[PDB]
Design a protein around this ligand. Structure first.
Ligand code: HEM
Ligand code: HEM
Ligand code: HEM
Ligand code: HEM
Ligand code: HEM
Lengths: 238, 238, 238, 238, 238
């Protein structure tokens, strides 16, 4: 019900937590593991009131990463308590943190200066799909960029948006403002059913001016499949 | 009593030590951990005469980090003695050092050359708050910066303060001069109850001239919650 | 049967998975290992319907890497499901992931602008050989490159083809377009029976203009021997 | 007999493999160590037909390295099989691979354009010595260098050779061409009885123009003592 | 007796060895540990003819480092044997190698071209003190520096010496020429009783031209306390 309430509002913190599994985890009986999976499910259900948790399977698509959480919360204190509780489960005890990124969702600052045709088209964001591919790309801008004026940056983002137009429906997008909460300026997140499309999207965006100013682009580039927490957890219990 | 002499005086060394918990710590009985946690509590109280020790929960906010200490001492040999004992406890035996940074506090070198109105406001530094967020950011400047004359750097630093003024109350700050004691020139430390404020603070500072001259900014950016040592250790002993 | 249709078609995903073996793997009886190798072979034929899996021996030629897979699939979900199961085997359980790269094969975009003499020559691609050396070289182009026009980029690739012509026969080649699926823009793959030929090819390509615009070239440079799954597995069961 | 044929011919592959000893090696009885040592001692004798293996003591001179092999072979498949067999022994089982580099020996490409005086002096290469120091320095040249024409590059190498002339006898030298076989362009190898001579040589070579064009110089720089395999392993069985 | 001859003479090698203590060292009875302490003491006493061994406590001041040796020898092979022998002791069995650097002492090469006041002032080097702080800073110069002539570098080094004059007495200094023996050109070593003094020294040196030409400055900067081997080991025999 309130899953759409956090996924759209401004001032909401999004956290991306990556985890890897110790090898001696498979040296455990399938029954100890089945119990450990139930513990995790109960915990997220317990937190289903304060925070929203979506889970992704990174195992086999991203190196040194088996699982990712995307946590939405009004305060990172909530995220901290939940993540700390998660790593405390018997499943969590066997997990190695492989990355942690935070960012807050905001209302667009440049869209207001775009052509109205571009504004209205931007009201489209992805399309209905089951178990889509998900990509997360952390971004650090070089310092020279922040010297530019509001008009110039508005221009760069329109050039940016213009190249991305063909993918409004076929590629869902989300942006998190991350500067000061970690070592990057932005966290970018995308959903898609066709990876060949997303590839062309990033390839198209490489042709604009804005792209020349990335100190960090990827590193890591997280690639996974969006899946119910149930299905992912099952894969760890055989 | 003298807890405030260390947090405010000049010539006081601040050391930041971050720790990650080994997985085989969870292979220990809750009985041994409660005993091991008791060991650490006594040690800091034992050292409660010469140095000040503050603990932070980094687990769930920073990757590869569960705990951080901020230790203040008049001589770094004392800090050395304390940490060496801490890492010797059974809790310490299972901890992986994730970084160790030192810096000394000083009297401002540029503030004297600021406008007097700006001087007086700088006398404001944070506000009363309970269990605040804490951010630690190591900073390395590129070499050309040190070539500039004192007047130019005063100008850079004034532009720096000018952008930071709106956050004097909502963001407490402290600076440690670290060059020669490790691989960074400064350690920056901040407390806040509002991360979105601290975020906006760094965004404002990214727009000034001095910012263009950072060889290293972050790496790591430490984010945690300030908490009594008791509560932190508690979380690891169940 | 249809294995060359994937190795040649466009819209086919190529994934490169590298593995190192844990030391505690050899503390197992030679009897258990053979059983575990048995576990792996059944899996590849079980997936031999949905995906193509080729295996390479990297042990002794590449540092910190013992095994590599080259998986071709219609969808990366298939690769993920296979790989997630593979690392789940009792053999995989003792394997440390050393890298994962994805890329899609496409029809040439620049060749159409080549001389007819050069185009026809390009239809030659490697030659018949047994258990050839294999090389994988990930590539990231710098951002300034993507600003150039189609004509300029066409010229650079013609000059590129021109220098590589002598190796059409002695060096099999394949290119994967990877941008957005990981931290590189291209994955290049080669088969050859004479490493000094492939060497002369790469020193020759270093002489061209296009070569100066590689932010990342190698890292890692993967060198291994192409072998049936049967022969490689032998080496971990001794 | 053919011991000098491999160390002098062109078309010979030189591979450098460094190893470190695990701590759990000492948790074995002194007889278990002697059995593992005899196994390795025996294994090299077995490969003494196809390839030449020279052993170096890096323990105490290079960090995270106790042993280095220098293997010469007409084909790298032999080297792979040998190293893969070595890493399989119970001694090797306790070993951590610390680096692996390949390169081919060639006949000089620039010397032909040198003064007859330089050619004749270059016929000097080292001197008679027992258990000499050995240094390995991997080199990556930057892309601009390969853009240069053959005449200009010949001049750079002459200026290069000229500074090196005083050390022809007291420092043995060998060059391996490595491009495409790994992430570096050259592998350099040296023997000497007086390290301060070799030091002065490297300082002397730092003064020429060509030196400014190394993207990578060292990393790692390997320092060890040339010693029979016999004495090296002996040191591990007490 | 000759302890002062080695610490001052030219042609003497200084080696810096870092060690970290294994966790399983504390799982031994305090009595078993004491024998190892006598074992090492006996070992150093045995080498007291050929080499000088000084010990430092890095634990609690340097990250990933508990102990450091500074070994002086007329030949580097002897250092190899002692270190190779030392890491073999039951103390050595529990020690983890953490870094290794070598360098040779020389007669000053630039000082002769200084003003005589600067020459005479330079004969001051530290002061009598017990258990001083010690700092080690590895240095790699960028290639352009070595292109400069003897006169120009003399000018650079004078400017360097000039900024350092205030610290002649309060900071002892020593310089090792390291090129070719590892990945750095120089190893710098300092003793001081006042770290804030050494800090001000490095801040002062950052302002001269020479500082801008460091490819590598620090990484790591080692910080520890000079202490007798006996007292340090006792701390490990508790
Ligand atoms: C796929 C469809 C996309 C659309 C329609 C789109 C459009 C936009 C728009 C309108 C903004 C302005 C935000 C604002 O005004 O507050 C923006 C910002 C941004 N986008 Fe995209 N974008 C797309 C894809 C991407 C991709 C693939 C990336 C990176 C891989 C990306 C990275 C960014 C970044 C870093 C910003 C913030 C730039 C800044 O504040 O300087 N976007 N995008
Ligand atoms: C309310 C927030 C802040 C205020 C009011 C403030 C103000 C100042 C002032 C007045 C100085 C000069 C001190 C002197 O003259 O010795 C200074 C120094 C410095 N500040 Fe801040 N600052 C704030 C936050 C930050 C933040 C968030 C960072 C980095 C993330 C930062 C980085 C630095 C550094 C590295 C120096 C020393 C630079 C040098 O000495 O060359 N400051 N700050
Ligand atoms: C006999 C050997 C080779 C031949 C004949 C050859 C030829 C070609 C041709 C015809 C293309 C056209 C691509 C297109 O039209 O879309 C191409 C693209 C490309 N090749 Fe090669 N190549 C060879 C080896 C290599 C090697 C060794 C590398 C790198 C180590 C490499 C890197 C690339 C890259 C990155 C592209 C695409 C770059 C871009 O689209 O901007 N090639 N090559
Ligand atoms: C007595 C000492 C030395 C002598 C006599 C010497 C001489 C030479 C000669 C004659 C060549 C020409 C090779 C050719 O024409 O194919 C050469 C190339 C080369 N040397 Fe040395 N050298 C010495 C020391 C060193 C050292 C210490 C290094 C590095 C640490 C080094 C690195 C190289 C490299 C990388 C090349 C090939 C570069 C290229 O082909 O672009 N040399 N040297
Ligand atoms: C009181 C303290 C210091 C004094 C009096 C001093 C003075 C000098 C002098 C006179 C030289 C000339 C050596 C020669 O002629 O061969 C020298 C060399 C050098 N110094 Fe210092 N220095 C001090 C501290 C430092 C520090 C703290 C560093 C780095 C952290 C440093 C880095 C170097 C390096 C790398 C060289 C060798 C450069 C070369 O040979 O080209 N010095 N120093």
């Amino acid at each position: 019900a309130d899953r759409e309430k956090l996924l759209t509002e401004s001032g909401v913190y999004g956290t991306f937590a990556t985890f890897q599994m110790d090898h001696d985890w498979w040296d455990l009986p399938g029954e100890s593991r089945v119990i450990s999976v139930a513990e995790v499910k109960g915990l997220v259900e317990q937190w289903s009131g304060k925070i929203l948790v979506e889970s992704y399977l990174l195992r086999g698509l991203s190196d040194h990463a088996d699982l990712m959480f995307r946590v939405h919360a009004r305060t990172l204190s909530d995220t901290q308590q939940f993540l700390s509780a998660f790593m405390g489960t018997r499943l969590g005890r066997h997990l190695t943190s492989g990355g942690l990124l935070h960012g807050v969702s905001k209302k667009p600052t440049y869209v207001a200066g775009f052509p109205e045709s571009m504004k209205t088209e931007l009201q489209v964001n992805g399309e209905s799909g089951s178990r889509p591919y998900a990509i997360v790309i952390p971004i650090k801008k070089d310092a020279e960029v922040w010297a530019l004026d509001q008009e110039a940056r508005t221009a760069l983002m329109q050039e940016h948006t213009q190249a991305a137009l063909p993918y409004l429906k076929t590629v869902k997008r989300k942006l998190y403002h991350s500067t000061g909460l970690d070592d990057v300026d932005f966290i970018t997140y995308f959903e898609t059913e066709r990876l060949e499309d997303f590839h062309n999207l990033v390839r198209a965006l490489q042709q604009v001016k804005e792209f020349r100013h990335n100190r960090r682009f990827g590193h890591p580039t997280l690639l996974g499949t969006m899946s119910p927490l149930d299905e992912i957890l099952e894969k760890f219990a055989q």
